[PDB]
């Protein structure tokens, strides 16, 4: 459809003018004196008269700066143009000088800035248009806020004037730039796409949903840890469409007198009902509707019941939806999680590593960075930070870069000159200081992500690779062939082996290969439930896995409570979990005989994969894998170091490639001592170049670090796992037989 | 409504209740309905104030103040009968209690047959197949399933529903039919089931599903079918019926698949509690929480409640809580208690006293005919080659 | 003050808080100070009534209602950060937390050097020695 075109630069000085192409005249058939509307970004538009010229390209419009800024479009962005036949004359558009270049003139200036500028053009002016008039070295832009016709106006010279108000400063611009767009929020792109799928199609198409007969949602729960901008996302969703926001604050309808807060709630829902397809938002829901245990009075119960009645009192034709915002779904009164009030619940959780790059890309916009900084490197660290913490990190790094420049920012110059105000760029060690010296992370709970370990990170074990492929990949990549002949999929294996042979580094590999999420709970996080008798606290770590559908939740040392329950609490939950969801439960252990035998009943945890000690090819793979970061000398052999370490576990030879690094860092620290402690350190024969005595790990560091090697696992305990492998009957008995012919 | 007569000012909600009962008294033979009763009359522990006690007593006085000539009846709606103030379960206020529980498999077909009325379906869909799955769904969840499948069928047609056509033409509005993989997507990708408690149903396993054991079949017929199919001959010469047997055998020889068979044959309901659901009562000291699983069995009269691994608490009570309940249960109701175990010596001998659990049927290992029966039975779904001998 | 906006009648303490924040907004780049925060906003367990919850929510709303152009900052004063209602340790209200802990040995010499200013000491006293103890 030939409506949307890219915008490029213009030469002409005339205003409210859009450029059309002369080869395309007969499709729109509008002549020179016709008015059109141009769709722009973040739901703000402008109006123009057309010009038919040849200096524009085939798909590119030449337009001036102030209407390119009123649409908020720049070079490359694509705008729409449409005819608007509702042109009419109006009365008293409210002009206002919004700049500081007025030079203190007050009174009637509008006889030289307004009346000679508008005539013989039929000038269309929309509300909020930021057109300028230049006269007497005074480029004053009149952004109108009150237009009595709708939506735009044609200014007549007989229009009576009303200009008793005072020109104001840039604050009214500061309340219009927070009509934010989709690009203004990052770190939750998947959840933004999902909530856009949930919300946007009812709002832009109210008729098709009534036409088929489906039900639009009535309440969405935006739960997640606090500070990740759960109010900015609702503003972005409402402003990217033609909605109408309404922010009900949490404790603001709690800080009223008794008998008056419910009046505020009724007024808010009435204003939502009267207006357009709209969206209200309730921030901090757990302060006006907590759990039932945290209700000692009764007026809070009156507020909660008022919320319930007004929530159920909406109609599907009213087109109002309600978004709340908590931190955890067990922190709400459960009387409003029934059907009809609050059912659909999305999870804008903690942003991940590559989800953290755009969230500081959007904060480092107005700050001049140097060329030495590397946003990817700082994004690699800062595990646990949320969006507000990263805003604080950016502000602290900028303040540290200011504070190092106190040699020019002095006490003698109280008024700071314009030198350092625009000539100070932040460098990388400022970011490392602001990360290291400050900013404790506000995160301790679990994190969902796809891991980045690869299959060749631990070579060998091809039977285990084939088995895990048969148990994870095939029920999800080909779900129809499992339905052709009715084999039900299994729901989890149980690894067992010697301690530290790459169990977690193997369990994450299939999660990475399947592009599946991976949560992980450990030993000390597990048994601290029943040491403090919080046994009924595994339901949340299971339905969190229910929410992310293709995940593989990984226990670790689940025999840790077998030193003296919660095994039964997982046991009553695993059978209640359905099979159409593809969540798998892989559990690891080191004492496989001490485990509860009820976990080995068919249906719960059937497969028993044995992980052996690492063989030769796996050893050279893990040895090369641990030396990615450290520069190693090219003559340092590794195949000879592979087949020399024979009975070594995978956690023992990962130690000698840290002992060798420590043994080289000792010599590289010590070599710098004598170089600064040169006796008669004279400028003659000075090493201006860095000598670099240890640039990389040499051969004799490994030759000396090998002397302290020790195998951790003995021979007497690997026979225990072989004996447990023999306790499994291991295909013994009759053996081969054949069907008769 | 429930919280609508709670969201008023103090001293005004009782005016609404009196006005409602007066309007019921003045009008025709009528019926009032009280939704969400446990928000205006909870248990006594969840009453820290006193105005809620005034509302509850106002409800009690206006409930008892009706006449049998007035022709008004009151229906309430809770979720569990232990979640009400027990001062209104006395005689004259709220006695008869019906149970519209979870719909079953073939009870789920009509509940989406009534929702797929205005939606054009194709010929490839099979409502019986989707009805076979979706264990745990309720009616609102199935409405959500239908709406999500229709939205997924809309969302795959974004190639015509474009941004260039803001006003949607009348093409796709009446020419889009949902197909089967949309239903499988909307079932798989979303819709967590809102059900974790027990379910009452008649099982569908058959007697030839496990062949052989003709003595056990004759014994179970003598202990289940004859006291209910011919209840007069047991009254001719006064033999009282027994109230439960105790299976015991090797682990995994088709105990539950045998216990469900007589329930299917008698057309009797079948509840089932398991091991981990049992001992989690006394691991968290909720010992007085078997009365509900017994009177739920009282409500469905011809049922056979089946324990499973009732020696699971004999690794280190609730056996006594069943023990004080089994003797209090009468015999005119025909509920039977079949319990299964694998370590029959470690069991409490007080369960074997005559009157409580007397019969001791031994289930052996499967013999040859039973083996060929179970081997053919497990290969119903999978197509097997015709020359594969069994 | 802490208990001064607690010792009023009901429905009048919030008027004092609104008047104080309005006077801070109207005046210069200024600083308000709240002494004894754990008497007007304790942990949730130490809240049996509801009027204290009204005071706490009024404090939260007026705290979040400031603008970055208004140039007013708020300093509170507790004794331990687990003795506050944790609904106001979120981002935007009270984040940066400094610790003026116990003064040490040589940090104790100046604190009595500033108190022995108007008192005439003899020559035998040794402020370093008494600073070594205590």
From Swiss-Prot, chain B:
The modification N6-succinyllysine is found at residue 386. It is found in: Cytoplasm, Cytosol; Endoplasmic reticulum; Nucleus; Cytoplasm, Stress granule. Changing residue 100 to T: In IBMPFD1; uncertain significance. Phosphorylated by tyrosine kinases in response to T-cell antigen receptor activation. Phosphorylated in mitotic cells. ATP 2 binds at residues 252-257. Changing residue 255 to Q: Impairs ERAD degradation of HMGCR. The modification N6-acetyllysine is found at residues 233, 236, 386. The modification Phosphothreonine is found at residue 167. Changing residue 49 to A: Does not affect methylation by VCPKMT. ATP 1 binds at residues 79, 115. The modification N6,N6,N6-trimethyllysine is found at residue 46. The modification Phosphoserine is found at residue 193. The PIM (PUB-interaction motif) motif mediates interaction with the PUB domain of RNF31. It is linked to Inclusion body myopathy with early-onset Paget disease with or without frontotemporal dementia 1: An autosomal dominant disease characterized by disabling muscle weakness clinically resembling to limb girdle muscular dystrophy, osteolytic bone lesions consistent with Paget disease, and premature frontotemporal dementia. Clinical features show incomplete penetrance. Frontotemporal dementia and/or amyotrophic lateral sclerosis 6: A neurodegenerative disorder characterized by frontotemporal dementia and/or amyotrophic lateral sclerosis in affected individuals. There is high intrafamilial variation. Frontotemporal dementia (FTD) is characterized by frontal and temporal lobe atrophy associated with neuronal loss, gliosis, and dementia. Patients exhibit progressive changes in social, behavioral, and/or language function. Belongs to the AAA ATPase family. Necessary for the fragmentation of Golgi stacks during mitosis and for their reassembly after mitosis. Involved in the formation of the transitional endoplasmic reticulum (tER). The transfer of membranes from the endoplasmic reticulum to the Golgi apparatus occurs via 50-70 nm transition vesicles which derive from part-rough, part-smooth transitional elements of the endoplasmic reticulum (tER). Vesicle budding from the tER is an ATP-dependent process. Homohexamer. Forms a ring-shaped particle of 12.5 nm diameter, that displays 6-fold radial symmetry. Part of a ternary complex containing STX5A, NSFL1C and VCP. NSFL1C forms a homotrimer that binds to one end of a VCP homohexamer. The complex binds to membranes enriched in phosphatidylethanolamine-containing lipids and promotes Golgi membrane fusion. Binds to a heterodimer of NPLOC4 and UFD1, binding to this heterodimer inhibits Golgi-membrane fusion. Interaction with VCIP135 leads to dissociation of the complex via ATP hydrolysis by VCP. This is Transitional endoplasmic reticulum ATPase. It comes from Homo sapiens. The lineage of its organism: Eukaryota, Metazoa, Chordata, Craniata, Vertebrata. The gene is VCP. The chain holds residues 270 to 672 of 806 of the full protein.
Curated annotation (Swiss-Prot), chain C:
Disulfide bonds: none annotated. Phosphorylated by tyrosine kinases in response to T-cell antigen receptor activation. Phosphorylated in mitotic cells. The modification N6,N6,N6-trimethyllysine is found at residue 46. It is found in: Cytoplasm, Cytosol; Endoplasmic reticulum; Nucleus; Cytoplasm, Stress granule. It comes from the Eukaryota. Changing residue 47 to A: Does not affect methylation by VCPKMT. ATP 1 binds at residues 79, 115. Necessary for the fragmentation of Golgi stacks during mitosis and for their reassembly after mitosis. Involved in the formation of the transitional endoplasmic reticulum (tER). The transfer of membranes from the endoplasmic reticulum to the Golgi apparatus occurs via 50-70 nm transition vesicles which derive from part-rough, part-smooth transitional elements of the endoplasmic reticulum (tER). Vesicle budding from the tER is an ATP-dependent process. Belongs to the AAA ATPase family. It is linked to Inclusion body myopathy with early-onset Paget disease with or without frontotemporal dementia 1: An autosomal dominant disease characterized by disabling muscle weakness clinically resembling to limb girdle muscular dystrophy, osteolytic bone lesions consistent with Paget disease, and premature frontotemporal dementia. Clinical features show incomplete penetrance. Homohexamer. Forms a ring-shaped particle of 12.5 nm diameter, that displays 6-fold radial symmetry. Part of a ternary complex containing STX5A, NSFL1C and VCP. NSFL1C forms a homotrimer that binds to one end of a VCP homohexamer. The complex binds to membranes enriched in phosphatidylethanolamine-containing lipids and promotes Golgi membrane fusion. Binds to a heterodimer of NPLOC4 and UFD1, binding to this heterodimer inhibits Golgi-membrane fusion. Interaction with VCIP135 leads to dissociation of the complex via ATP hydrolysis by VCP. The PIM (PUB-interaction motif) motif mediates interaction with the PUB domain of RNF31. This is Transitional endoplasmic reticulum ATPase. It comes from Homo sapiens. The chain holds residues 270 to 403 of 806 of the full protein.
């Amino acid at each position: 459809r030939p409506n949307r075109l890219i915008v490029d630069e213009a030469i002409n000085e005339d205003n409210s003018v859009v450029s059309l192409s002369q080869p395309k005249m007969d499709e729109l058939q509008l002549f020179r004196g016709d008015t059109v509307l141009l769709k722009g970004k973040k739901r703000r538009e402008a109006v123009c008269i057309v010009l038919s010229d040849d200096t524009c390209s085939d798909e590119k419009i030449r337009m001036n700066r102030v209407v390119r800024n009123n649409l908020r479009v720049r070079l490359g962005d694509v705008i729409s143009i449409q005819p608007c036949p509702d042109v009419k004359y109006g009365k008293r558009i409210h002009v206002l000088p919004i700049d500081d270049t007025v030079e203190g003139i007050t009174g009637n200036l509008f006889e030289v800035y307004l009346k000679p500028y508008f005539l013989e053009a039929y000038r269309p002016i929309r509300k909020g248009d930021i057109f300028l008039v230049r006269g007497g070295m005074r480029a004053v832009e009149f952004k109108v806020v009150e237009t009595d016709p709708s939506p735009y106006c044609i200014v007549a010279p007989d229009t009576v004037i009303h200009c008793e108000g005072e020109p104001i400063k840039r604050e009214d611009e500061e309340e219009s730039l927070n009509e934010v767009g989709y690009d203004d929020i990052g770190g939750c792109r998947k959840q933004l796409a999902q909530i856009k799928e949930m919300v946007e199609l009812p709002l832009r198409h109210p008729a098709l949903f009534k036409a088929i007969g489906v039900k639009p949602p009535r309440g969405i729960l935006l739960y997640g840890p606090p500070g990740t901008g759960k109010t900015l996302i609702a503003r972005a969703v409402a402003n990217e469409t033609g909605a109408f926001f309404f922010l009900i604050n949490g404790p603001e309808i709690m800080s009223k007198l008794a008998g008056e807060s419910e009046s505020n709630l009724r007024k808010a829902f009435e204003e939502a009902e009267k207006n357009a397809p709209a969206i209200i938002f309730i921030d901090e829901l757990d302060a006006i509707a907590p759990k039932r245990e945290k209700t000692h009075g009764e007026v809070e119960r009156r507020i909660v019941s008022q919320l319930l009645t007004l929530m159920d009192g909406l109609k599907q034709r009213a087109h109002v939806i309600v978004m709340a915002a908590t931190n955890r779904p067990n922190s709400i009164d459960p009387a409003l999680r029934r059907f009809g009030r609050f059912d659909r619940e999305v999870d804008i959780g903690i942003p991940d590593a590559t989800g953290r790059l755009e969230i500081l890309q959007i904060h480092t916009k107005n700050m001049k960075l140097a060329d030495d900084v590397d946003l990817e490197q700082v994004a690699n660290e800062t595990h646990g930070h949320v969006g507000a913490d990263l805003a604080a990190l950016c502000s602290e790094a900028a303040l540290q870069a200011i504070r190092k420049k106190m040699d020019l920012i002095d006490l003698e110059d109280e008024t700071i000159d314009a030198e350092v105000m625009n000539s100070l760029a932040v460098t990388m060690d400022d970011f490392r200081w602001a990360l290291s010296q400050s900013n404790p992370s506000a995160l301790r709970e679990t994190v969902v992500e796809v891991p980045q370990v690869t299959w060749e990170d631990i070579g060998g074990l091809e039977d285990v690779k084939r088995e895990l492929q048969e148990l994870v990949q095939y029920p999800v990549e080909h779900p129809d062939k499992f339905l052709k002949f009715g084999m039900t999929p299994s729901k989890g294996v149980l690894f067992y082996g010697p301690p530290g042979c790459g169990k977690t580094l193997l369990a994450k590999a299939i999660a990475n290969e399947c592009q599946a999420n991976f949560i992980s709970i450990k030993g000390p996080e597990l048994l601290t439930m029943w040491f403090g008798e919080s046994e009924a606290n595994v339901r949340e770590i299971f339905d969190k896995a229910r929410q992310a559908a293709p995940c593989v939740l990984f226990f670790d040392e689940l025999d840790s409570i077998a030193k003296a329950r919660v095994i039964n609490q997982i046991l009553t939950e695993m059978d209640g979990m359905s099979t159409k969801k593809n969540v798998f439960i892989i559990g690891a252990t080191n004492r496989p005989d001490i485990i509860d035998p009820a976990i080995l009943r068919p249906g719960r945890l059937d497969q028993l994969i044995y992980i052996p000690l690492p063989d030769e090819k796996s050893r050279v793979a893990i040895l090369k894998a641990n030396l990615r970061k450290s520069p190693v000398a090219k003559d340092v052999d590794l195949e000879f170091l592979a087949k020399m370490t024979n009975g070594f576990s995978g956690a023992d030879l990962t130690e000698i490639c840290q002992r060798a690094c420590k043994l080289a860092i000792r010599e590289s620290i010590e070599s710098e001592i004598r170089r600064e402690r040169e006796r008669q350190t004279n400028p003659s024969a000075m090493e201006v170049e860095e000598d670099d005595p240890v640039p990389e790990i040499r051969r004799d560091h490994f030759e000396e670090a090998m002397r302290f090697a020790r195998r951790s696992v003995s021979d007497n305990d690997i026979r225990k796992y072989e004996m447990f492998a023999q306790t499994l009957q291991q295909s013994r008995g009759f053996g081969d037989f054949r069907f008769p012919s």
